[PDB]
Amino acid sequence: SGYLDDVSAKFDTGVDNLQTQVTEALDKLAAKPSDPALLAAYQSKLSEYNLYRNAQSNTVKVFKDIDAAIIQISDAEIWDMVSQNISAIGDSYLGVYENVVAVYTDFYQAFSDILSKMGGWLTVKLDVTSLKNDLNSLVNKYNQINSNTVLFPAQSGSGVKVATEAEARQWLSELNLPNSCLKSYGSGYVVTVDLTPLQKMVQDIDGLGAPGKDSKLEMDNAKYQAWQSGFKAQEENMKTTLQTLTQKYSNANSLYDNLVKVLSSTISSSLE
């Protein structure tokens, strides 16, 4: 509607420009595959690319509300109306991340609670059978599809909300999670927490050997230290995963804010 048309172009151009920067960033990374910073730059670009496409696909809904709000002018005021009239985008981007981190945190806490009773299960003798029972139970619980396991889509209330495969795969790639996290359900797909560390744990407990009468298992210090270390390392992986999702969320907040600045500056210039 008049000045909105300009804003629509800005998204198109932005989407085009980003599509190119995602490629440029992927190349730079290819040349130095193990660089932490190059990987994040590439991924930020992808996240940003997905964000503009998101906005692009919500053009109709968003422009409608913004136009209304407009039909009633400070730059700060423009920025504010844009800020409260783009939930279509906000809820499907930041809302998702908010949910990803909330769910992964609860998942990690559930694990922490299990660690709490390790001493109670301890050459050395470890209550192998009972520790593995809690781990295996944790796995089966978080290996289901419900509001305690799903990262994307956000599960709003009672029932199970799914997405198309491409949508879920896009979030799978943005969160950089393994394929084991992608699950089918009903008409679509969902992204759930990574259980690989837990499964590796119970798996390694099995490698300690069959227990005895106590159903427990005693082992010399060498064998125990190596087990305790491999175990702690798996816990660290889950901790690392939680932290990377948190950092991606924080990065997303900044990309979202920048998009709002662009959107606002355009609308402003268009009204002049």
Author numbering: 6 to 77, 129 to 178, 186 to 335
Question: Can I see the authors' text?
Answer:
Bacterial infections including Salmonellosis and Shigellosis affect millions of people every year. These bacteria use a T3SS to secrete virulence factors to manipulate host cells. The T3SS is a multi-component system that forms a continuous protein transport channel through the two bacterial membranes and the periplasmatic space that extends into the surrounding medium by a needle structure. SipD from S. typhimurium, IpaD from Shigella flexneri and BipD from Burkholderia mallei are tip proteins that are thought to interact with their corresponding needle subunits PrgI, MxiH and BsaL, respectively, to make the needle tip complex.
Here, we address the questions of how the Salmonella SipD interacts with PrgI and deoxycholate and the mechanistic consequences of the assembly of the T3SS needle tip complex. For instance, the presence of deoxycholate either impedes (S. typhimurium) or facilitates (S. flexneri) host invasion.
